[PDB]
Design a protein around this nucleic acid. Structure first.
Ligand SMILES: Nc1ncnc2c1ncn2[C@@H]1O[C@H](COP(=O)(O)OP(=O)(O)O)[C@@H](O)[C@H]1O
Ligand SMILES: Nc1ncnc2c1ncn2[C@@H]1O[C@H](COP(=O)(O)OP(=O)(O)O)[C@@H](O)[C@H]1O
Lengths: 516, 516
DNA sequence: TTTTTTTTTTTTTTTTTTTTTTTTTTTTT
DNA sequence: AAAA
């Protein structure tokens, strides 16, 4: 029967071997059959095929009946004795064998035999490999061409994961679309920054390789954060987006004994966000380069082994407090972006202040669980992604935002404790002073850092190189003992310093050819 | 049935026993059969024989037909009564068992029985033992002789692991080959160093015993590092190369109850690298001698037993910051090599400066996932390896490079704290200097090192010996109490002052004549 | 306070059992 | 038609 069953549904069941070696089945659902919500036109995993057993027992019996009536007909026609005896023996044997198809053990054996024919090599590892296909509640969305196309019929693309958000073409006249656009515009007034943030967030749908970017934006509190940042994750669903933990960035270099189980996250997921923390924290300068770069990343999670994989997911970090970055290498400080929210939300609006408005808690308590709002947001996001693709050819760095890369470099001017310490505690001594050797500078810098920013361990040797790299390079002399000495300085302790764009008409999403 | 089946394909299936005692099957992939990308002409592991199960019922069935008609022929020829009755009984017995080959349990029993016949003793442990054979996407490559031979037909070498890179003969006229050669030449201008690094990197393909070499090379940042370091590992693939963690080189020593997993790596992997992680880490002189020697290394792993394997892998290291190496024995510092980059890459070129170049991000963001570049890079690598084999008889110590082994000894001059301290703080005694008891100099040197390099603990015993090993041996006296007193030493505690080649035309890969 | 973390690794499954047997109708009485 |  296995061959006949393969003839039955060669287009509705696929058998594949998992990592553990247990064969698993996958079936292509069709409309009008018992099923979950929003999986139509998608493959679904399965362990013990029920539809197969039902089809074997019910539909397959019709063919047996056809065989039986064919035997009836050929026995009816006149013939010779020997052929009639042969037909009678064949009929008796076939009737004896007919009832076996309803037996449980026979059906199980048939299934075990048939799982070999249904096998299709290279099916698990090709699942969801194409980054241009997204599973949606009403079918599949392909972003390969412009415009994106919705497929809701038979196809051959092996997609298994999905989101339960139905897609509709971007309609600006939808009331919820209008509400979302107005709220988003009110969240951040700058049009260039608005377009830049929307463009950056649009790339989350893509799951292939992306440019090495880092986005972090900081505010006082009660701002637009955690509203759209959580809304994007809710729209994308758990399958394609995932929340992270800030401990992934604040943790020191754990030993090989520690099985860091959060590194295995982001596998396949194209968007990850760090929720607002509770205190100002300090980066380790590790877990940054490997979390920004598009190269291979690998780590063991828990009671398993080192596994390499590609990490491709847009990152966002929002905190009410401030961050700590301590480095000046051009490798970093170049794949990072910082923004600061200029708006505030409170119950009683302050008149004549455009940078403060009445907060509506209804945006957070509800408006997330409404499917219509999620559908409108998804349409807006796909429209923005199509805009980016048709304008800058998928190059996020190409787009221009004057406010960005200016506030970013302004922040880069901060987070430099060494230069600030030099300006605070070093002055141009004309004469009547010594060379101070070299250890005094690192010692004073260490104690000032402990008593001004935070207490932490320091290495005396490493601080020297930036000391030459600092502005004190001109007053950095050599020594007959082949050491580095300082000059033209006084080391001070207390404060005894005395020792002589535009706006759109009615639509901003329509955008202007030159960056608006 | 099992004997006949063993006669069917005794040249396509091999049964062996793993460590756990479970029998496993291996199948020889041939062209024109279902198979994943790039495993042609190579053995593949298998758990539950599939093609065997199909062959039992499809091709083998015909054989019984050849028997059946034969009986009819003998039944057709006229003979005695008894022989005809014998043939009738034979046919009646045989027809009722003809269909038995389709039963699932019968097939499983036949497979279980034939498991013994197909067994080939000493097959798993002899897999990939030959180091001259590599599995490539279009067959197998043998580096046994010169030129290397690409086998793409039947053979008998038991290889199972492979890389998915198709091999082509080295052609300089390929555009990717020219681009890679130009970029690599630009990465490090020095011809001798370029040839030496290419020669060293060529040995990653070999998997047998290698020379005890540890190459490390530093740079300011945004350099050629992490580009070819990742490129080589990508080209080799996960099977023959893997990434390690710098923790293995900074952890002091893990004690018992250790779930060591990264230590027990490098099973056959001939290439190892460390990306630029941490900020100016420290070495404690452990985990180098066993990580440089060609000796056997033994380790356990999670729910495993402590097993010993021959560690053979070309090791490379690169960082933006400085290392801390503290030892002076001739055994070490002899299996080490140092290099430093001399170029910088940035978005704003400096004209007339040969040591600055416009960096091309495309080299990283892409050019890795393109197979066309990978094939050319592999061809370059194998060509360089064959050049080394024909020139220096496979020995990397005999190759000539003046810049290397000169900058390396220059680095060895650094990382010597005792010499620097001696010619920084202690000078010859002018007058009124005593014996200073014993080990007071190293006692002060402890705090000097803590305030100058880094904080750590010290032991007086070994530190005493290097004082004799230092230049201060001449100014060391014996004492009536049989103690090593220190004479002729000022022991100063202040900073104010002491108290009284060439390049070819256009083909560097041509290697130039023997001096090169 | 930081340091070992202590508990997560180890157990503990797993998964037993159905397999079959019998019958078996027809053949043989 | 009942027993192997
Ligand atoms: N465009 C908007 N108009 C009015 N109210 C808003 C708007 N965006 C957000 N809000 C409200 O302001 C509050 C902001 O709080 P929250 O998002 O927690 O700030 P933060 O994330 O910065 O801590 C939310 O409860 C939300 O209901
Ligand atoms: N020979 C070259 N010519 C032009 N650009 C290069 C060359 N080598 C590297 N680059 C570019 O310069 C950048 C250097 O960055 P990276 O390799 O990360 O340096 P590092 O590893 O020292 O931080 C790379 O992104 C690469 O695109």
């Amino acid at each position: 029967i296995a061959k006949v069953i393969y003839a039955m549904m060669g287009n509705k069941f696929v058998v594949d071997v998992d990592s553990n070696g247990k064969y698993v089945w996958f079936e292509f659902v069709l409309p009008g059959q018992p099923m979950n919500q929003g999986e139509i036109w998608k493959w679904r995993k399965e362990v013990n095929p029920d539809e197969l057993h039902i089809y074997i027992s019910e539909n397959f019996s019709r063919v047996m009946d056809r065989i039986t009536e064919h035997i009836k007909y050929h026995l009816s026609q006149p013939h010779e004795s020997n052929i009639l005896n042969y037909y009678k023996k064949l009929l008796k044997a076939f009737e004896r064998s007919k009832s076996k198809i309803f037996n449980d053990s026979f059906k199980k054996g048939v299934i075990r035999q048939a799982e070999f024919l249904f096998r299709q090599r290279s099916f698990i590892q090709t699942l969801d490999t194409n980054p241009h296909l997204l599973g949606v509640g009403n079918g599949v969305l392909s972003i390969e061409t412009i415009p994106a196309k919705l497929i809701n019929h038979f196809h051959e693309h092996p997609i298994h994961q999905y989101t339960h958000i139905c897609y509709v073409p971007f309609n600006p006249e939808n009331p919820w679309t209008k509400l979302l656009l107005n709220a988003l515009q009110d969240i951040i007034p700058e049009l260039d920054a608005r377009l830049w943030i929307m463009f950056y967030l649009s790339t989350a749908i893509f799951r292939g390789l992306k440019e090495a970017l880092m986005l972090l934006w900081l505010g006082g509190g009660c701002n637009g954060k955690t509203f759209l940042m959580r809304l994007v994750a809710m729209v994308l669903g758990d399958h394609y987006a995932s929340k992270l933990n800030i401990s992934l960035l604040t943790s020191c270099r754990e030993t090989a004994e520690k099985p860091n189980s959060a590194f295995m996250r982001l596998k396949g997921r194209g968007y990850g966000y760090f929720e607002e923390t509770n205190k100002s924290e300090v980066l380790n300068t590790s877990r940054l380069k490997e979390m920004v770069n598009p190269g291979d990343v690998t780590a063991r999670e828990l009671n398993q082994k080192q596994e390499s994989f590609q990490m491709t997911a847009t990152m966002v970090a929002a905190s009410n407090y401030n961050f700590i970055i301590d480095t000046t290498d051009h490798g970093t400080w170049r794949r990072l972006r910082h923004y600061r929210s200029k708006v505030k939300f409170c119950h009683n609006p302050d008149p004549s202040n455009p940078y403060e408005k009445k907060e509506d808690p209804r945006f957070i308590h509800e408006y997330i669980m409404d499917p219509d709002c999620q559908n409108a947001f998804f349409s807006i996001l796909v429209y923005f992604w199509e805009k980016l693709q048709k304008e800058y050819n998928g190059q996020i760095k190409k787009v221009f935002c004057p406010t960005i890369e200016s506030e970013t470099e302004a922040y880069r001017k901060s987070q430099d404790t060494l230069h600030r310490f030099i300006t605070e505690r070093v002055v141009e001594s004309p004469s009547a002073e010594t060379v101070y050797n070299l250890s005094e500078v690192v010692t004073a810098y260490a104690e000032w850092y402990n008593t001004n920013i935070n207490v932490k361990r320091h290495i005396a040797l490493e601080l020297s190189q930036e000391l030459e790299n600092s502005v004190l390079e001109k007053y950095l002399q050599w020594s007959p003992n082949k050491t580095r000495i300082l000059k033209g300085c006084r080391i001070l302790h207390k404060f005894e310093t005395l020792q002589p764009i535009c706006e759109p008409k009615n639509k901003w999403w329509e955008w202007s050819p030159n960056p608006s």
